[PDB]
Amino acid sequence: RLANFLVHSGNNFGAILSSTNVGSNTY
Amino acid sequence: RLANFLVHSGNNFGAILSSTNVGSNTY
Amino acid sequence: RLANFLVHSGNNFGAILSSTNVGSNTY
Amino acid sequence: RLANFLVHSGNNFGAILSSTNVGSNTY
Amino acid sequence: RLANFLVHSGNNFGAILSSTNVGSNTY
Amino acid sequence: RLANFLVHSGNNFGAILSSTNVGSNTY
Amino acid sequence: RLANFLVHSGNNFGAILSSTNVGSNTY
Amino acid sequence: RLANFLVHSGNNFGAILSSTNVGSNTY
Amino acid sequence: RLANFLVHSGNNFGAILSSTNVGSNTY
Amino acid sequence: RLANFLVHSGNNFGAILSSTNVGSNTY
Amino acid sequence: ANFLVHSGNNFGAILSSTNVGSNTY
Amino acid sequence: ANFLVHSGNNFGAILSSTNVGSNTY
Amino acid sequence: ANFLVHSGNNFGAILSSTNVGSNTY
Amino acid sequence: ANFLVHSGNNFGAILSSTNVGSNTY
Amino acid sequence: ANFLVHSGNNFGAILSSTNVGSNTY
């Protein structure tokens, strides 16, 4: 019985320019 | 019994320019 | 018995320009 | 019985330029 | 019974330029 | 008056999400 | 008056998330 | 008046998250 | 008046997170 | 008036986090 | 005499803004 | 005489801003 | 006489700003 | 006579700023 | 006569600033 939690809650990102893998969940 | 949770809740992104894989869930 | 959850709830995106894979779920 | 928690709550990012793997969860 | 917690709460990042692995959880 | 309630009394093995926008300018 | 309540009394093995925006300018 | 309550009385083995924005300019 | 309460009375084996922004300019 | 309370009376084996921003300019 | 010239300006996306790319007098 | 020239300016994204890329007099 | 010239300026992202890339007189 | 020249300036990201990349007189 | 020249300036990120990369007179 294995449980994996990847959560994003109430996060604010002002500006994202020429970036990669920002605010993402990767399994 | 395996459970995987990838959640995005209440996230705000002001501006995203020329970016990749922003605010995404990848399994 | 395997359950996978990829959820997007209440997310706001102001502007998305020339970007790829933004706010998406990929399995 | 194994449980893994990767959480992001109430984080603010002013500006992200030409960066990689910012504010992300990787399993 | 093993539990691993990787948490980010109330963190503020003013500006992130040409950086890698900032404010991220890696398992 | 605004009253927003999320009540849980049973056994939950899945995802329960609630998103609310009251009198807001959301982009 | 604003009243936001999250009440949990049962057994939870999953994710319970709540997001609220009241009178805000969200981008 | 603003009242934000998170109440937990049962057995929790998962994630319980709450995010609130009241009268804010969020980017 | 602002009242923010987090109350816990049961047995918690997981994550309980609360994030609040009241009358703020968040970037 | 601002009242921020975190009350714990039960048995906690996990993480309990609280983040609050009241009338602030956060970047 | 007052001369105002506006040319060749590219605007990506404008949200809830005022007096953008205009000749205001 | 007053001369104002605006040319070849690229703007990515503008949010809740005032007097951006404008000839204000 | 007053001469104001604006050319070849690249702006990435502008949020809650005033008088950006403008010829203000 | 007053001459103001602005050219070839790259701005990455601007947040809650005033009089950025402008010819203010 | 007054001459102000601005060229080839790279700005990474600007937050809550005033009179940045500008020709103020």
Residue numbers in the entry:
A (entry chain G), B (entry chain D), C (entry chain A), D (entry chain J), E (entry chain M), F (entry chain C), ...: 11 to 37
K (entry chain B), L (entry chain E), M (entry chain H), N (entry chain K), O (entry chain N): 13 to 37
Task: Copy text verbatim from the article accompanying this structure deposition.
Human islet amyloid polypeptide (IAPP) is a 37-residue polypeptide hormone that is co-secreted with insulin from pancreatic β cells and plays an essential role in glycemic regulation. IAPP forms amyloid deposits in the pancreas of >90% of individuals with T2D.43–45 A single genetic mutation resulting in a serine to glycine substitution at residue 20 (IAPP-S20G) is associated with familial, early-onset T2D.46,47 Recently, cryo-EM structures of IAPP amyloid fibrils assembled in vitro for the wild-type (WT)48–50 sequence and IAPP-S20G48 have been determined, as well as those of patient-seeded WT IAPP. Here, we used cryo-EM to determine structures of amyloid fibrils at different times during in vitro fibrillation of a disease-related variant of human islet amyloid polypeptide (IAPP-S20G). Strikingly, the fibrils formed in the lag, growth, and plateau phases have different structures, with new forms appearing and others disappearing as fibrillation proceeds.
The fibrils present after 6 weeks, which represents the growth phase of fibril formation, are strikingly different to those observed at the 3-week time point. More surprisingly, and in marked contrast to the single structure solvable to high resolution at 3 weeks, six distinct fibril polymorphs could be identified at this time point. However, four fibril structures could be solved to high resolution (3.1–3.4 Å). The IAPP-S20G fibril polymorphs share a conserved two-protofilament (2PF) core, with one polymorph containing an additional peptide chain to make a 3PF fibril in which the additional chain has a different fold to those in the 2PF core. However, they share the ability to accrete new subunits to form additional protofilaments that lead to the generation of higher order fibril assemblies. This principle was suggested in our earlier work that first revealed the structures of 2PF and 3PF S20G-IAPP fibrils, but that study lacked the temporal (and spatial) resolution of the present study. Here, we describe structures that show that subunit accretion is a generic property of in vitro IAPP-S20G fibril assembly. Accretion of different subunits then builds larger fibril assemblies by different packing of these five subunit folds.
